[PDB]
mmCIF file of C-alpha atoms and ligand atoms in Angstrom:
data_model
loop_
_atom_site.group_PDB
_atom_site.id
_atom_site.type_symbol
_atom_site.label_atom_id
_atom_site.label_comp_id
_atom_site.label_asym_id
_atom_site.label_seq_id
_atom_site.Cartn_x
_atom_site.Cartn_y
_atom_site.Cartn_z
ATOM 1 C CA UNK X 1 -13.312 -41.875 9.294
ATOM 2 C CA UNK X 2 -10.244 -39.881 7.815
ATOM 3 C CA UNK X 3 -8.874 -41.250 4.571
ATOM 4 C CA UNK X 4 -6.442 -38.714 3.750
ATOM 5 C CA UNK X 5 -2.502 -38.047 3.985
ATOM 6 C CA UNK X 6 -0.654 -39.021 7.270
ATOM 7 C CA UNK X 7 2.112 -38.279 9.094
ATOM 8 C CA UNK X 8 4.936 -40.908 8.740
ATOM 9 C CA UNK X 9 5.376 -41.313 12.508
ATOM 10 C CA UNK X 10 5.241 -37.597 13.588
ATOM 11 C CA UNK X 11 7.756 -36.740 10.239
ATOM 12 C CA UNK X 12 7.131 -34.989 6.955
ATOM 13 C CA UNK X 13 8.521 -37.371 4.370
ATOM 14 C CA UNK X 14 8.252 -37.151 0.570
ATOM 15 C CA UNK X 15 5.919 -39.161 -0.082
ATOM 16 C CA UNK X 16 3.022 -37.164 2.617
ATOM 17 C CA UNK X 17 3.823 -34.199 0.716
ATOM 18 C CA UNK X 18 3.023 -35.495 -2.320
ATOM 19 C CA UNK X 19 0.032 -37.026 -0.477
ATOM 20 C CA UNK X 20 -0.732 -34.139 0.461
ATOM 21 C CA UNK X 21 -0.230 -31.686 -2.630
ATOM 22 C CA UNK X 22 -2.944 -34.027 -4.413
ATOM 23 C CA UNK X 23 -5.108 -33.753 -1.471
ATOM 24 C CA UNK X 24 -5.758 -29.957 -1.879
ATOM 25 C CA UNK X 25 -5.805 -30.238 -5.249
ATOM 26 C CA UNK X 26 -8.513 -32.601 -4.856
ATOM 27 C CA UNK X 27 -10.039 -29.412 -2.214
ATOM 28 C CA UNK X 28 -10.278 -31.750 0.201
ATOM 29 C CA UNK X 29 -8.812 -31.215 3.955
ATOM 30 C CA UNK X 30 -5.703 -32.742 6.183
ATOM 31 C CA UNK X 31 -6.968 -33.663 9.213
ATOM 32 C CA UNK X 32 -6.581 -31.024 12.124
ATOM 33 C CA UNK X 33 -4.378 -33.101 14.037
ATOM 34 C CA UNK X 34 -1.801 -33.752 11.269
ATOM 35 C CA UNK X 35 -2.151 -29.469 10.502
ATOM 36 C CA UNK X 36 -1.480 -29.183 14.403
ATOM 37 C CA UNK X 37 1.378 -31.481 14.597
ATOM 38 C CA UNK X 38 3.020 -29.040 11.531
ATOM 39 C CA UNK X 39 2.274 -26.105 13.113
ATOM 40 C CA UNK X 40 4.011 -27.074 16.205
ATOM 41 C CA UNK X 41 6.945 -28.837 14.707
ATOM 42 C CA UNK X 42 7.705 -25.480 11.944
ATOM 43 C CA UNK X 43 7.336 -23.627 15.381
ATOM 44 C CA UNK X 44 10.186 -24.960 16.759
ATOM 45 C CA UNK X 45 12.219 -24.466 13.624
ATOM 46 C CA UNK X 46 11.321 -21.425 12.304
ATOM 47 C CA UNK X 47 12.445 -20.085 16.740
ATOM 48 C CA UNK X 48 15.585 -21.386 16.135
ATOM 49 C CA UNK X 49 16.370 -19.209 13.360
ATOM 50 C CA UNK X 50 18.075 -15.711 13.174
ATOM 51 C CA UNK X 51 15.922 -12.411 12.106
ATOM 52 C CA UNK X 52 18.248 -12.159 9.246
ATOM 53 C CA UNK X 53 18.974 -15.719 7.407
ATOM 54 C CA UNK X 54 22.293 -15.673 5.899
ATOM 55 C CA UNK X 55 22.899 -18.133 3.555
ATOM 56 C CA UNK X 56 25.708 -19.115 1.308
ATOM 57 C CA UNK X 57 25.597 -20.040 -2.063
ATOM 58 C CA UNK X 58 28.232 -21.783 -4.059
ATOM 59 C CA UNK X 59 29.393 -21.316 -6.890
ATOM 60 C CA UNK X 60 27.770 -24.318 -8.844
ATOM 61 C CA UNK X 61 24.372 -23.995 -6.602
ATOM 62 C CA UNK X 62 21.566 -21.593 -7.586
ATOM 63 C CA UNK X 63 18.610 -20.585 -5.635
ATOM 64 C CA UNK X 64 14.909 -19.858 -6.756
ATOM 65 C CA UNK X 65 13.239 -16.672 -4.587
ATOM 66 C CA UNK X 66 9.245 -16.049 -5.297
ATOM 67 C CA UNK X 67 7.491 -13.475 -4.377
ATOM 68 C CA UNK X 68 3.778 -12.686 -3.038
ATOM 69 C CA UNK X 69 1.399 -16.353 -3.304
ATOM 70 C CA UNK X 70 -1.327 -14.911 -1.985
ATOM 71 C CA UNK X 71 -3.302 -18.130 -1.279
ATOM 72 C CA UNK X 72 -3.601 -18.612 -4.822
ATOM 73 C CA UNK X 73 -3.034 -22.593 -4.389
ATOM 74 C CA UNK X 74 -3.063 -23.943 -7.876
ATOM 75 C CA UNK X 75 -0.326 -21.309 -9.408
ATOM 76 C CA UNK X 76 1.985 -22.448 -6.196
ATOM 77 C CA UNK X 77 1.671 -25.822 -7.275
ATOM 78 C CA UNK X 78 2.158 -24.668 -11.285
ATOM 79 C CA UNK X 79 5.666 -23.111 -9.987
ATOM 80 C CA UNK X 80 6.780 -26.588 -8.733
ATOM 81 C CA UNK X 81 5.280 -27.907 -11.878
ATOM 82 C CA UNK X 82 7.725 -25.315 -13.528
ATOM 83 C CA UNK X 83 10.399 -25.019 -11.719
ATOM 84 C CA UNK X 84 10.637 -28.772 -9.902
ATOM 85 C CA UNK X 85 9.789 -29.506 -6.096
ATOM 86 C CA UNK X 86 11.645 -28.037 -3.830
ATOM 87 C CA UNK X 87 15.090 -30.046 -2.206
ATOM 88 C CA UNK X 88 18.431 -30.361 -1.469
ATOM 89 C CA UNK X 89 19.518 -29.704 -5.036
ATOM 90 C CA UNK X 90 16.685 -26.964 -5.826
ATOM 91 C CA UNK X 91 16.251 -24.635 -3.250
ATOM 92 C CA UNK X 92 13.722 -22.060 -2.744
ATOM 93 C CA UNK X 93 12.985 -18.461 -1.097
ATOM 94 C CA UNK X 94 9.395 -17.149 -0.150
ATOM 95 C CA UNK X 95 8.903 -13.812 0.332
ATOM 96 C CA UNK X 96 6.072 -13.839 2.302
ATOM 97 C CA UNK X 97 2.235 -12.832 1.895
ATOM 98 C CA UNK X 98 1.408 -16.424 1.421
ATOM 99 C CA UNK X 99 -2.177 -15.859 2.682
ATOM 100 C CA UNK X 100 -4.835 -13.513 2.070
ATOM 101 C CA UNK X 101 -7.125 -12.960 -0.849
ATOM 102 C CA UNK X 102 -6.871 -16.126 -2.579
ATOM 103 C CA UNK X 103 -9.107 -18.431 -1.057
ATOM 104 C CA UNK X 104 -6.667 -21.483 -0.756
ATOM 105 C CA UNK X 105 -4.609 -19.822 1.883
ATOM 106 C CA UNK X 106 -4.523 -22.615 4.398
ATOM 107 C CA UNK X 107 -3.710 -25.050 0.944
ATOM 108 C CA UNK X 108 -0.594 -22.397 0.357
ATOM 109 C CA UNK X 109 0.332 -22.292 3.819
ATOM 110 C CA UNK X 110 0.377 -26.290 5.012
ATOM 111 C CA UNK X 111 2.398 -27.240 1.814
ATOM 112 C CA UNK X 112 4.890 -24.446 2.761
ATOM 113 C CA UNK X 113 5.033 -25.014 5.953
ATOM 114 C CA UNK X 114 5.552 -28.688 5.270
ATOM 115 C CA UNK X 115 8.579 -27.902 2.937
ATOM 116 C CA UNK X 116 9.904 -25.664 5.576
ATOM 117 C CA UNK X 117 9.719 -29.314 7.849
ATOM 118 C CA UNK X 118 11.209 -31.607 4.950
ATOM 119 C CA UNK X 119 13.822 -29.325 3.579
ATOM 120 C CA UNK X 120 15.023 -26.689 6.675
ATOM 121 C CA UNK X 121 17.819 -25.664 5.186
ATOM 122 C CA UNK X 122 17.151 -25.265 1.381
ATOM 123 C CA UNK X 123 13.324 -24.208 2.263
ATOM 124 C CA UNK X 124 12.982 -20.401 3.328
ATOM 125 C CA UNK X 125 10.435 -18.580 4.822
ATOM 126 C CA UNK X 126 10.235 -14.859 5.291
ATOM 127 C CA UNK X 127 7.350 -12.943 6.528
ATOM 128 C CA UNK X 128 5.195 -10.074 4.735
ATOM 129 C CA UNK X 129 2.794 -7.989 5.731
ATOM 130 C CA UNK X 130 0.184 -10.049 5.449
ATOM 131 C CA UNK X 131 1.476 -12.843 7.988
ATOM 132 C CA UNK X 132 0.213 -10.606 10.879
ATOM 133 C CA UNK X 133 -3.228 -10.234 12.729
ATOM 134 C CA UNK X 134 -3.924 -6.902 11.846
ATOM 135 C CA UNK X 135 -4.363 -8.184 7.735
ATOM 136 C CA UNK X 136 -5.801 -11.789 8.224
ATOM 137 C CA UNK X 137 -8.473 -10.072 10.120
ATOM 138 C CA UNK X 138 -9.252 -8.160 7.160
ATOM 139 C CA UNK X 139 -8.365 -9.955 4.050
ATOM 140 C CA UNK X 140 -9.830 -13.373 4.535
ATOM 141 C CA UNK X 141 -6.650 -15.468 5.721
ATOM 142 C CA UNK X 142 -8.610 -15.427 9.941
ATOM 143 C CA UNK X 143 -12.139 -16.390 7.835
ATOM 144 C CA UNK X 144 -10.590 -18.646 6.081
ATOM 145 C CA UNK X 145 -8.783 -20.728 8.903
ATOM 146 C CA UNK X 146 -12.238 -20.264 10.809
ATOM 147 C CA UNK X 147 -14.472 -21.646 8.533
ATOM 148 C CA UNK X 148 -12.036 -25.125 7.828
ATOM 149 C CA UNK X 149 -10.898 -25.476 11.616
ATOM 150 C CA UNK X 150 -11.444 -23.731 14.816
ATOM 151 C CA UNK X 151 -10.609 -19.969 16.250
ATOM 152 C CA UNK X 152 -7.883 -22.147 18.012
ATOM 153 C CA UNK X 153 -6.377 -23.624 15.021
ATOM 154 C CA UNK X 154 -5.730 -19.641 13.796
ATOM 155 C CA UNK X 155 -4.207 -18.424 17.120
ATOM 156 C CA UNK X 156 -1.403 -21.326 16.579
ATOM 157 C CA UNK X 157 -1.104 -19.637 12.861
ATOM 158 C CA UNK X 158 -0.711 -16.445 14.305
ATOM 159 C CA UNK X 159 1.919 -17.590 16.649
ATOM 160 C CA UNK X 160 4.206 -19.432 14.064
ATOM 161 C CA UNK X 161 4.050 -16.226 11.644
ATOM 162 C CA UNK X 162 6.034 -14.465 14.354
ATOM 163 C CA UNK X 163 8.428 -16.667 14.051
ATOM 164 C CA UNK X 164 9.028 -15.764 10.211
ATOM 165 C CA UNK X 165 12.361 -14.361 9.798
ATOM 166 C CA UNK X 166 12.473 -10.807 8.097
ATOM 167 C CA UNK X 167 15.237 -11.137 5.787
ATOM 168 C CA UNK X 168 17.739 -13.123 4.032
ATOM 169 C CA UNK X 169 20.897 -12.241 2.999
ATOM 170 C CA UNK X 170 22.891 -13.985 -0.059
ATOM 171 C CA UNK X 171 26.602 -14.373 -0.254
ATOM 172 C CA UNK X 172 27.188 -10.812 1.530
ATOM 173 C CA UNK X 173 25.666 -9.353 -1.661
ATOM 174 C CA UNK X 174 21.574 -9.702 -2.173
ATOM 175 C CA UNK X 175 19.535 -8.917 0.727
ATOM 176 C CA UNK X 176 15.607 -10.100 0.204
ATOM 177 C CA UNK X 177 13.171 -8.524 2.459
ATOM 178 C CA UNK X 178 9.327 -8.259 1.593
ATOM 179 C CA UNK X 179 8.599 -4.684 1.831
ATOM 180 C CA UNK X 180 11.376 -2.740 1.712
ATOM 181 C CA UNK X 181 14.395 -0.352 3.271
ATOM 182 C CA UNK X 182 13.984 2.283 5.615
ATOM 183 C CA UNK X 183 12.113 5.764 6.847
ATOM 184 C CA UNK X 184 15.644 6.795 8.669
ATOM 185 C CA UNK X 185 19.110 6.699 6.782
ATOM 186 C CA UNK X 186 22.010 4.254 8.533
ATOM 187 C CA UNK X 187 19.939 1.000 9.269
ATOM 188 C CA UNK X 188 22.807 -1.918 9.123
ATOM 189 C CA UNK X 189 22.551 -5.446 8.756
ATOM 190 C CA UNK X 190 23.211 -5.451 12.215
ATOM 191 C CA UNK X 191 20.426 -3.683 13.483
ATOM 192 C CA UNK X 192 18.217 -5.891 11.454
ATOM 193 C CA UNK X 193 19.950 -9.123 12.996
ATOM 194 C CA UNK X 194 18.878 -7.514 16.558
ATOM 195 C CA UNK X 195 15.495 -7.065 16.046
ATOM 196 C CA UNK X 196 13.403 -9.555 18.124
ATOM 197 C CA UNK X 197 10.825 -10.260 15.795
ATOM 198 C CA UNK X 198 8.174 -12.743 17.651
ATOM 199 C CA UNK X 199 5.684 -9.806 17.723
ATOM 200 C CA UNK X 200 2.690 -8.235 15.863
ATOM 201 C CA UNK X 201 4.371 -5.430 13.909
ATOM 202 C CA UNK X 202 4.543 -2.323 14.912
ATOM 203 C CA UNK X 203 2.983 1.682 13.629
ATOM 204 C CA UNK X 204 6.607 2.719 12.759
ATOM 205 C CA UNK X 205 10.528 1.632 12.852
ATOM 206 C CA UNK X 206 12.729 -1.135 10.840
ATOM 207 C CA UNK X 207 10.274 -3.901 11.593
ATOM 208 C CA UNK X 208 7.407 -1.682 9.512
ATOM 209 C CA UNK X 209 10.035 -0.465 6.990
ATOM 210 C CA UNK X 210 10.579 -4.286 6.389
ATOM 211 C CA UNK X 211 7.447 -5.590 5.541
ATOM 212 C CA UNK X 212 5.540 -2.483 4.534
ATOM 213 C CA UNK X 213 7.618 0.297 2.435
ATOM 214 C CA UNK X 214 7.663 0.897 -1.379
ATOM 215 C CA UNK X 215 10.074 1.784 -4.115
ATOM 216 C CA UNK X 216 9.736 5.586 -5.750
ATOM 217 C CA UNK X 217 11.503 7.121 -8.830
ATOM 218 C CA UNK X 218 12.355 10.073 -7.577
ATOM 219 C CA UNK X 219 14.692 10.974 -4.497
ATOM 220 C CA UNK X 220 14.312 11.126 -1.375
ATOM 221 C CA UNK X 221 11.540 9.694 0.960
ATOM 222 C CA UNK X 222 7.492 10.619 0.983
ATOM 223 C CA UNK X 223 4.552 9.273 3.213
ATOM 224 C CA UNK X 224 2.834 6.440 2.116
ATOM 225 C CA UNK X 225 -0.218 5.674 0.944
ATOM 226 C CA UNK X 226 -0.315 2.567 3.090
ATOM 227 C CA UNK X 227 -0.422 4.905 6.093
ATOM 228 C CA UNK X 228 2.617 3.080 7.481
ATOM 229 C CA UNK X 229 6.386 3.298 6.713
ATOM 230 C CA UNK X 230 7.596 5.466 3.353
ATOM 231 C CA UNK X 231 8.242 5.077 -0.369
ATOM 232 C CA UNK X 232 12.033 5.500 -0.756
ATOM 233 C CA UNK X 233 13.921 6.731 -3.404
ATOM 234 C CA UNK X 234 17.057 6.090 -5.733
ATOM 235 C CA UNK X 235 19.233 7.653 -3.191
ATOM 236 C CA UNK X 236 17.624 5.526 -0.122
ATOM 237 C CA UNK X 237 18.610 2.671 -1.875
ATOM 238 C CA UNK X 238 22.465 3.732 -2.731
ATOM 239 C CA UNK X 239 23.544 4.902 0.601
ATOM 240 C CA UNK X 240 21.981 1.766 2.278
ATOM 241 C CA UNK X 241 23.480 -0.662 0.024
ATOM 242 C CA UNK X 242 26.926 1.294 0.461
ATOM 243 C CA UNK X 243 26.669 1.492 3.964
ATOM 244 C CA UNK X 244 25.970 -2.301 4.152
ATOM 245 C CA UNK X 245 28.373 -3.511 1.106
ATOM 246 C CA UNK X 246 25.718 -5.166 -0.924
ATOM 247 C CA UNK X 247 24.794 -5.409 -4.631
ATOM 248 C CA UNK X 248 21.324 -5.049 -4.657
ATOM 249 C CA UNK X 249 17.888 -5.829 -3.247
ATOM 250 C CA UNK X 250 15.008 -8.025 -3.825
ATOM 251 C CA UNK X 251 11.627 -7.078 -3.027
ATOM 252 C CA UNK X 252 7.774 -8.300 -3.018
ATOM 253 C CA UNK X 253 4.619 -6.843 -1.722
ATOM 254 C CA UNK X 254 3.170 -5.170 -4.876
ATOM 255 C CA UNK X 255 1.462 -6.441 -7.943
ATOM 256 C CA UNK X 256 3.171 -5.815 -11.613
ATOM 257 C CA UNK X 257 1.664 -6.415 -15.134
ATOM 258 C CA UNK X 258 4.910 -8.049 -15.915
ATOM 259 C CA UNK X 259 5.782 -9.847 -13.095
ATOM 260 C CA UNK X 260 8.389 -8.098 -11.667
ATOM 261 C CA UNK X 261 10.438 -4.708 -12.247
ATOM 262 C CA UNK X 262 13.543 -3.272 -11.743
ATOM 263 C CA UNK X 263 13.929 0.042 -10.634
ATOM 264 C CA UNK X 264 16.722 2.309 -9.475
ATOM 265 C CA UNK X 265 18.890 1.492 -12.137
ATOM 266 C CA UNK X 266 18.907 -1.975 -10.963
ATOM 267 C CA UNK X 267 19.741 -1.434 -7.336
ATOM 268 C CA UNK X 268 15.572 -2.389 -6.390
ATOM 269 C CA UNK X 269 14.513 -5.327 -7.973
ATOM 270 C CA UNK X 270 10.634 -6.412 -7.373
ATOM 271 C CA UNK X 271 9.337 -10.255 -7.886
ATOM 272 C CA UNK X 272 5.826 -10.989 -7.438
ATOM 273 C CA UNK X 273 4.687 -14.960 -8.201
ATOM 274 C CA UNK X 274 0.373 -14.761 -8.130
ATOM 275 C CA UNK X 275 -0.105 -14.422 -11.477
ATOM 276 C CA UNK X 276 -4.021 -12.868 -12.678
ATOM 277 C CA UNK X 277 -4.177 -11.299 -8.692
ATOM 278 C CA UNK X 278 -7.450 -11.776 -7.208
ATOM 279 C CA UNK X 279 -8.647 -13.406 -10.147
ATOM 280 C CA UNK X 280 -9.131 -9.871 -11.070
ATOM 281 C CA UNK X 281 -5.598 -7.926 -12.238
ATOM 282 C CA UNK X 282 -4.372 -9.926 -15.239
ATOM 283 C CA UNK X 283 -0.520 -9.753 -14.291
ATOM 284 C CA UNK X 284 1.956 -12.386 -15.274
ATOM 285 C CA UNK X 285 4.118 -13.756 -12.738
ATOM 286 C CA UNK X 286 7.601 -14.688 -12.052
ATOM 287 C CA UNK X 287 10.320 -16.176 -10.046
ATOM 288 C CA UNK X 288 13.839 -15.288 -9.824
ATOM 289 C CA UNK X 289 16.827 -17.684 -10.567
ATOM 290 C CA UNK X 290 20.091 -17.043 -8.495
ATOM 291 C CA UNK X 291 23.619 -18.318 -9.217
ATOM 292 C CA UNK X 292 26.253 -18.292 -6.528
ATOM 293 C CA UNK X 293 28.725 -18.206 -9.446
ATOM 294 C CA UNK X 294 26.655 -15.178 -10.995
ATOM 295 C CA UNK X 295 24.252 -13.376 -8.164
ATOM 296 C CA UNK X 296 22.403 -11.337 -11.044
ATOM 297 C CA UNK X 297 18.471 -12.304 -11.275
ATOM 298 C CA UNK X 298 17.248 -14.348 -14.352
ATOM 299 C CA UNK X 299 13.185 -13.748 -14.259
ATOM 300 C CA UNK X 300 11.320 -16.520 -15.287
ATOM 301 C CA UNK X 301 7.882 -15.232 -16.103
ATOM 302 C CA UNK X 302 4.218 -17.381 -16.396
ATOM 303 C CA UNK X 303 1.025 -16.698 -16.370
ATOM 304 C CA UNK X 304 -2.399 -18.257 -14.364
ATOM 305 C CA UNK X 305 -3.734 -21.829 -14.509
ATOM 306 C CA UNK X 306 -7.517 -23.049 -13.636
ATOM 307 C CA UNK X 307 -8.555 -23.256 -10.258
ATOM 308 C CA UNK X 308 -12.240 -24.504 -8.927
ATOM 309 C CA UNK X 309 -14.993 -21.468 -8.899
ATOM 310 C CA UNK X 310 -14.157 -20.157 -5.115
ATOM 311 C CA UNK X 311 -14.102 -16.372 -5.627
ATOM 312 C CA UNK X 312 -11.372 -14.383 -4.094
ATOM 313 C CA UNK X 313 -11.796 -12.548 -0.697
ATOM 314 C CA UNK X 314 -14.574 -15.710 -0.011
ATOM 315 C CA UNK X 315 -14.102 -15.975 3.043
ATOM 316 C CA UNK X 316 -13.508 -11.981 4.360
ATOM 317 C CA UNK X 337 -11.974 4.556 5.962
ATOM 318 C CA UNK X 338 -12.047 2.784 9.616
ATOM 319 C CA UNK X 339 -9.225 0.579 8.744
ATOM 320 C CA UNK X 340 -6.182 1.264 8.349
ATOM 321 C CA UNK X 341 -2.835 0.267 6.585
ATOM 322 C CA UNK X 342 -3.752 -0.863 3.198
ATOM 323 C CA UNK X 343 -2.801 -3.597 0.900
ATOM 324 C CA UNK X 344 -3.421 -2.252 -2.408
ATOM 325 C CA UNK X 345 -6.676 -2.759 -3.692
ATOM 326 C CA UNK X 346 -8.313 -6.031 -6.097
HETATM 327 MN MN1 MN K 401 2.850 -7.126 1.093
HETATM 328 MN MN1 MN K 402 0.927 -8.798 -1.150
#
């Protein structure tokens, strides 16, 4: 009979997190009633939310925003080794893609989720690409969920990643989104705020922009190579942070050797936090270090640690809208 963490009388304390990190490090699994009770209860949180967060930081607090996790377990728990556990005091932004590829994607997902629980309002959520259907079908997150619990255990996945707000705004200034800005000029913060987001997203519009466009160095806008959404230029990037009075933007969704980059003169910064990508791309990582005194981004870089021998994409031309490859 099950030996492992517990819920503390249907709450998420401290001390079943910690429980719980060592657990999956262990690779062993929570029992499918204490992952349902999670589910349920980030459900009802993560409704309650706005489709744009807006959050304010003063000017002693900072904030720490990562990038892409990509089910890659054992780096998520060597960025709390880095950078301290998440509370009160150190609060955190995920850019979503949490799942898909690496195989510990229901390890990533229960430990954030479980944050989200313990910390709601210094614990932040926002979904990517890959917290739809359309991807976990294809790159391993579905399998995955299969294989440890039930078909039904995945359908309540799939209904608390439309939840996922789409973007956070800092201090008026830094707006966060995974993807990117948009294929039609004079999107406002506004119009993102209306969006009703508890959906699968859709072929085209500010939703797709969101979680599926790309940065490009030259101006204007071109077709991606996703075969959704745009790559944006220089100019993109000016007129919408102009329009919308902000400093700059902070961005996900694609792999760098580095860890991050900064494009369009600084106006498009990217952060991407799964370091040696599909156990294949040998990338450092990084994580981003906000100051509400100082709203500039401090990257703190680091590189892969062990995990056990699970190969990525375990557990995954006709289809279409691509991650890049792995
Ligand atoms: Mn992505
Ligand atoms: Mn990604």
């Amino acid at each position: 009979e099950y030996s492992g963490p517990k819920l503390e009388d249907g709450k998420v304390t401290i001390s079943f997190m910690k429980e719980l990190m060592q657990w999956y490090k262990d690779q062993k699994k929570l029992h499918r009633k204490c992952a349902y009770q999670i589910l349920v209860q980030v459900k009802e949180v993560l409704s309650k939310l706005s489709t744009l967060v807006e959050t304010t930081l003063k000017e002693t607090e900072k904030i720490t925003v990562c990038g892409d996790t990509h089910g890659q377990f054992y780096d998520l728990l060597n960025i709390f080794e880095l950078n301290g556990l998440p509370s009160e005091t150190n609060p955190y932004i995920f850019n979503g893609d949490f799942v898909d590829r690496g195989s510990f994607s229901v390890e990533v997902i229960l430990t954030l989720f479980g944050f989200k629980l313990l910390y709601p309002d210094h614990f932040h959520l926002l979904r990517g690409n890959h917290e739809t259907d359309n991807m976990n079908q294809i790159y391993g997150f579905e399998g995955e969920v299969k294989a440890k619990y039930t078909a039904q255990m995945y359908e309540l996945f799939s209904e608390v990643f439309e939840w996922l707000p789409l973007a956070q705004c800092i201090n008026g200034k830094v707006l966060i989104m995974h993807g990117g800005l948009f294929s039609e000029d004079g999107v406002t913060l506004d119009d993102i705020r209306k969006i009703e987001r508890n959906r699968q997203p859709p072929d085209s519009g500010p939703m797709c922009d969101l979680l599926w466009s790309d940065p490009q160095p030259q101006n204007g806008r071109s077709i991606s190579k996703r075969g959704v959404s745009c790559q944006f230029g220089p100019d993109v990037t000016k007129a919408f942070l102009e329009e919308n009075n902000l400093d700059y933007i902070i961005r996900s969704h694609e792999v760098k050797a580095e860890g991050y980059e900064v494009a369009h003169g600084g106006r498009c910064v990217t952060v991407f936090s799964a370091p040696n990508y599909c156990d294949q791309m040998g990338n450092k990582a990084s994580y981003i270090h906000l100051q509400g005194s100082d709203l500039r981004p401090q990257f703190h870089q680091f590189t892969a640690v062990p995990h056990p021998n699970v190969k990525p994409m375990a557990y995954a031309w006709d289809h279409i809208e691509v991650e890049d490859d792995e």
